[PDB]
């Protein structure tokens, strides 16, 4: 039978069938529960909502993400999310399909072990596999060499790969992703007069981010231009009809990716992280890595992100190096597309962990 | 000349001179307009009353606060309040004294800009400065490391400070303060048959809160005790001789600080807010923050607030660490006391914004 | 057995059986007592009268309402009213039917407790329930979302409901209803030369109000028109044959709903109260509340009330909001109709308070 590919990231769940071109189900990884007292009898009032249903009813619900920074924090909510994905979105029998999951690098072992246990026991899947997302991004890109920069909702990581060989010592992970930018934007909108404090309001700020934010090619000159003119301002309409005007906050939000000190982090920017990762590799490899910077994930969808990354890397790298950044139009689903490609390959069918192997050797099999 | 310190709170105005141990002028931030029509011609009736005189005449006036949630909403009323405090209360010429003002963190920029514009253009103050209330609360305590929980009439906030360095990424703010507690007390007093609907009766309810409310160490135990005996009931005499008895309303009102869901907000209580602020800081300074939990502002004056907060934080924080809450007797005036200390230091005499600087750099100077 | 539904409002008693389309008995909530000396021994003078009996004999009686502003103030008279309703109007044995009662939100707790105690220990009902009138209005309107503006004889209240979840922190209430308009009309009619001072004449004035009053779309323009022409005047014939002409008093009376200052109240009009209640709800809720303004109760029967409400709300709310007001032709009995619908639902039969629960828990059970 065809295999399932479920890229359950921090922000969105992308699920589908191996070999299919694009994910079939794409819904936010959200579980909402009512925060008010019900007064009308019956009328189909459920005790919890998941995915797109929770988004529609977010006015009366308190929304919680089961995954934070790529680590599952509430396993009941995660079981709920997987149950939704399999039964209501895909509408398939889990026991009929082997499922391919994904995980970020440098994650706790207990996370993967518990995920495997839930998949085999609660859903009775025949076989499963857990893959590193940055590796699947390269499969999606259709090349075996390059340094992937995957930036989702929870984590940002770099994974150099050369001729199909990974370099685990050069893997970099940065706990700063779309959610932190959303929180910074929430903080930064207050100085202009708007207050967004509830979980539901945090979803409006995320939409403002996804619609109006962009990366400035030169931060100081952009700030000066914004201060000296209103040409950069845009307007956005809230669900209740109130209209807000956002100015230099448009590019100050994603600028946190390059200056994490804006949110009090001591780490370096994504450009510095990629350059450091490249320099961790052997001297004979760096030339090929400079020319194959593959970007992935939703957070790399800001306008001007690729140009800013290229400018910064060219500044850090020595001249005579051909810095080139590959930004496919479908970066958002590149991890899922790669998972689809990987699960279809004939040479991969031996990598599945069958339930026999799992139960005869324990959860630790998933670390092989 | 001696500087002026004016702690423009959202519920009270506290003004005085730098160096004094207590503010000279303390009156409610209130402006009242007559709502009936006069019939007597020989009186010196005037169209607006401010401060104490508005409280004395509240029967025939519609009282309205110009400041809500630390944000000035009516600028004509605020100008009237400032004129009153400068001339009728302090009896000074503003042009002869530098003025130190205060504000809550995460406020709109336009608020500071307009405050500075009014201070320089209307009152012709020679120089002025706008400080953050929580920072001055630390000066009032003499120490330089601690996490300040300032809770006034409109806004509650946390500000962690370590060795004189503020950690702005850890600042927290709730729009839940004495005003909301007064409104909730008005709501729940109806359960016993008492109806307060007018703005002048809101002041009566505020007095009831200030005189009879207290914080329960264990909320459910008190709820059980109240239902079991009348030992908790107290009587209050209204301005017209009526006597009203309130029971569990005494500690249900301030409980809203720890369970904001009582008023429909999904925010976390003040204990959770301070704990989260501490955990936003570096692991190496948390031990010092836990031991220097400072309180300030009027709403931190409920009996048993300190013990309840200590118990809650001790529950949240790991053991083997000394949770200690500093609740001085002068919590109400701590912000103004600190502002008095700061305005007198010889090291601060170069931080004033001079009229010469302002009238050439523009209103944006106040954000330095 | 069939359940009884009794809507004990301040003005009228509407009683009937669940499942019927309209109330069976609708009579004023009046108790009259003779105020002169009987001189004919043979006649059945009778010591007190109730409902229509009192209304038809109002010439020799002094009429008293046991309910004032939705609160029962004379419990003997209310027991008399209920005895009339059960035995003379419906002609049923109350011990054979469960009864569904109603009351306004934010009422004193003792009101429900005394009501339950009288119902269980005096009439020996098998089970009973006490609902919120604004909630039953939605059942009658057959929808799950909306903000109900219920305005009867004693009390006006707003209750936002979303997907069957009530927002009790946004519930508003005004003590300004049909009775206050009747009193204002009595006062206003004096300036034209008509004096109505007795209780029996209050009923004539109430009839005049029901017959001739209407809401002006633009109050100032209407006042200007009436002062320049007699086209707006109408004539009314009193019981003794005197004819009185009424001019701009026709629309000045119901204008008190929008300008409570006419009767000395500083509260906001019903339009402002509805808008404020909407703005108390979460920003994702407001779109639906604006489109489902539900009106119920007698005082919402003034011609032009719906158009005036729509115009005022449109003025207050932001543009691009589809403000719509639902005004069923049976607004008067919407609360009773909803109670009938609710009491007949199978899913509701678990919510009855059986007398066993009252015995083993006392009156306190009714607050769960």
């Amino acid at each position: 039978t065809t295999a399932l590919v479920c890229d359950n990231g921090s922000g969105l769940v992308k699920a589908g069938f191996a070999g299919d071109d694009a994910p079939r189900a794409v819904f936010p990884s959200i579980v909402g529960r009512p925060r008010h007292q019900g007064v009308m009898v019956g009328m189909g009032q459920k005790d919890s909502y998941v995915g797109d249903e929770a988004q529609s009813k977010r006015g009366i619900l308190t929304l919680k993400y089961p995954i934070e920074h790529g680590i599952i924090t509430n396993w009941d909510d995660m079981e709920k999310i997987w149950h939704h994905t399999f039964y209501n979105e895909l509408r398939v029998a889990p026991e009929e399909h082997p499922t391919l999951l994904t995980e970020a690098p440098l994650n706790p072992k207990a996370n993967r072990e518990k995920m495997t246990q839930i998949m085999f026991e609660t859903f009775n899947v025949p076989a499963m596999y857990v893959a590193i997302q940055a590796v699947l991004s390269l499969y999606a890109s259709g090349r075996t060499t390059g340094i992937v920069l995957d930036s989702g909702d929870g984590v940002t990581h770099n994974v150099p790969i050369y001729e199909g060989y990974a370099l685990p010592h050069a893997i970099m992970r940065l706990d700063l992703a779309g959610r932190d930018l959303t929180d910074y934007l929430m903080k930064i909108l207050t100085e202009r007069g708007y207050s967004f404090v509830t979980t539901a309001e945090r979803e409006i700020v995320r939409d403002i981010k996804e619609k109006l934010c962009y990366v400035a090619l030169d931060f100081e000159n952009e700030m000066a231009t914004a201060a000296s003119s209103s040409s950069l301002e845009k307007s956005y309409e809230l669900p209740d009809g109130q209209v807000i005007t956002i100015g230099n906050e448009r590019f100050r939000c994603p600028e946190t990716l390059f200056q994490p000190s804006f949110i009090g982090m001591e780490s370096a920017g994504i450009h510095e992280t990629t350059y450091n990762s490249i320099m961790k590799c052997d001297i004979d490899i760096r030339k090929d890595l400079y020319a194959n910077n593959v970007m992935s994930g939703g957070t790399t969808m800001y306008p001007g992100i690729a140009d800013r990354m290229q400018k910064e890397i060219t500044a850090l790298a020595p001249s005579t190096m051909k810095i080139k950044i590959i930004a496919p139009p479908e970066r958002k689903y590149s991890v899922w597309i790669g998972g689809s490609i990987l699960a279809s390959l004939s040479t991969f069918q031996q990598m599945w962990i069958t339930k026999q192997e799992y139960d005869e050797a324990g959860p630790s099999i998933v670390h092989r | 000349t001696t500087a002026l310190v004016c702690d423009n709170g959202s519920g009270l105005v506290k003004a005085g001179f730098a160096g004094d141990d207590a503010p000279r002028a303390v009156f409610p931030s209130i402006v009242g307009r007559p709502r009936h029509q006069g019939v007597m011609v020989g009186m010196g009736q005037k169209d607006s009353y401010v401060g104490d005189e508005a409280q004395s005449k509240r029967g025939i006036l519609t009282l309205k606060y110009p400041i809500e949630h630390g944000i000035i909403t009516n600028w004509d009323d605020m100008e009237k309040i400032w004129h009153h405090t400068f001339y009728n209360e302090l009896r000074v010429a503003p042009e002869e004294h530098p003025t130190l003002l205060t504000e809550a963190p995460l406020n709109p920029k336009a608020n500071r800009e307009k405050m500075t514009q009014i201070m320089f253009e209307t009152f012709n103050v020679p120089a002025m400065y706008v400080a953050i209330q929580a920072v001055l609360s630390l000066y009032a305590s003499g120490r330089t490391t601690g996490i300040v929980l300032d809770s006034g009439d409109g806004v509650t906030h946390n500000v962690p400070i370590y060795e004189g360095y503020a950690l702005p990424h850890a600042i927290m703010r709730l729009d839940l303060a004495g005003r909301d507690l007064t409104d909730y007390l008005m709501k729940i007093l109806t359960e016993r048959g008492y109806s307060f609907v007018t703005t002048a009766e809101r002041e009566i309810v505020r007095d009831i809160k200030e005189k009879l409310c207290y914080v329960a160490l264990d909320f459910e135990n008190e709820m059980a005790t109240a239902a079991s005996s009348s030992s908790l009931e107290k009587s209050y005499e209204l301005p017209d001789g009526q006597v009203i008895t309130i029971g569990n309303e005494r500690f249900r009102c301030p409980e809203t600080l720890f369970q904001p869901s009582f008023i429909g907000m999904e925010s976390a209580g003040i204990h959770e807010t301070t704990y989260n602020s501490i955990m936003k800081c570096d692991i190496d300074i948390r031990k010092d923050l836990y031991a220097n939990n400072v309180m300030s502002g009027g709403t931190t004056m409920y009996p048993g607030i300190a013990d309840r907060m200590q118990k809650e934080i001790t529950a949240l924080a790991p053991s083997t660490m000394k949770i200690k809450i500093i609740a001085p007797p002068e919590r109400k005036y701590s912000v103004w006391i600190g502002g008095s200390i700061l305005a007198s230091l010889s090291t601060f005499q170069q931080m004033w914004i001079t009229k010469q600087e302002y009238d050439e750099a523009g209103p944006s100077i106040v954000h330095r | 057995t069939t359940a009884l539904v009794c809507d004990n409002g301040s003005g009228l008693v509407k009683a009937g059986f669940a499942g019927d389309d309209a109330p069976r008995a609708v009579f004023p909530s009046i108790v009259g007592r003779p105020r002169h000396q009987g001189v004919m021994v043979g006649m059945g003078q009778k010591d007190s009268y109730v409902g229509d009996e009192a209304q038809s004999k109002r010439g020799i009686l002094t009429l008293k309402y046991p309910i004032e502003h939705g609160i029962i103030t004379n419990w003997d008279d209310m027991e008399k009213i209920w005895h009339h309703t059960f035995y003379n109007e419906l002609r049923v044995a109350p011990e054979e039917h469960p009864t569904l009662l109603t009351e306004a939100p934010l009422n004193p707790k003792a009101n429900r407790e005394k009501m339950t105690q009288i119902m269980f220990e005096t009439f020996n009902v098998p089970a009973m329930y006490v609902a919120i009138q604004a909630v039953l209005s939605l059942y009658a309107s057959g929808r799950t979302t909306g903000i109900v503006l219920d305005s009867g004889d004693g009390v006006t209240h707003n209750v936002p409901i979303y997907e069957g979840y009530a927002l009790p922190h946004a519930i508003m209430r005004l003590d300004l209803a049909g009775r206050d308009l009747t009193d204002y009309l009595m006062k206003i009619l004096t300036e034209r030369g008509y004096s109505f001072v007795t209780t029996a004449e209050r009923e004539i004035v109430r009839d005049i109000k029901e017959k001739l009053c209407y809401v002006a779309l633009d109050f100032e323009n209407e006042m200007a028109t009436a002062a320049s022409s007699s086209s707006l005047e109408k004539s009314y014939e009193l019981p003794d044959g005197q004819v009185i002409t009424i001019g701009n008093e026709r629309f000045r009376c119901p204008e008190t709903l929008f300008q409570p200052s006419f009767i000395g109240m500083e509260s906001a009009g019903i339009h402002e109260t509805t808008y404020n209640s909407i703005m108390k709800c979460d920003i994702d809720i407001r779109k639906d509340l604006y489109a489902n303004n539900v009106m119920s109760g007698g005082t919402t029967m003034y011609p032009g009330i719906a158009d005036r409400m729509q115009k005022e709300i449109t003025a207050l709310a932001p543009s691009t909001m589809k403000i719509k007001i639902i005004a069923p032709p049976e607004r008067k009995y919407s609360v009773w109709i909803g109670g009938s619908i609710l009491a007949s639902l199978s899913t509701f039969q678990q919510m009855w308070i059986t007398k066993q629960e009252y015995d083993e828990a006392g009156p306190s059970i009714v607050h769960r």
């Binding site: 202009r192 007069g193 708007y194 207050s195 967004f196 404090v197 309001e201 809230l238 109130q242 807000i244 | 809500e68 949630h69 944000i71 909403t73 709109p108 729009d175 | 703005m279 920003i283």
Partner: peptide, 7 residues
């Protein structure tokens, strides 16, 4: 309330 957008 007393802000510019929400609250």
């Amino acid at each position: 309330p007393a802000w510019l957008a929400t609250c």
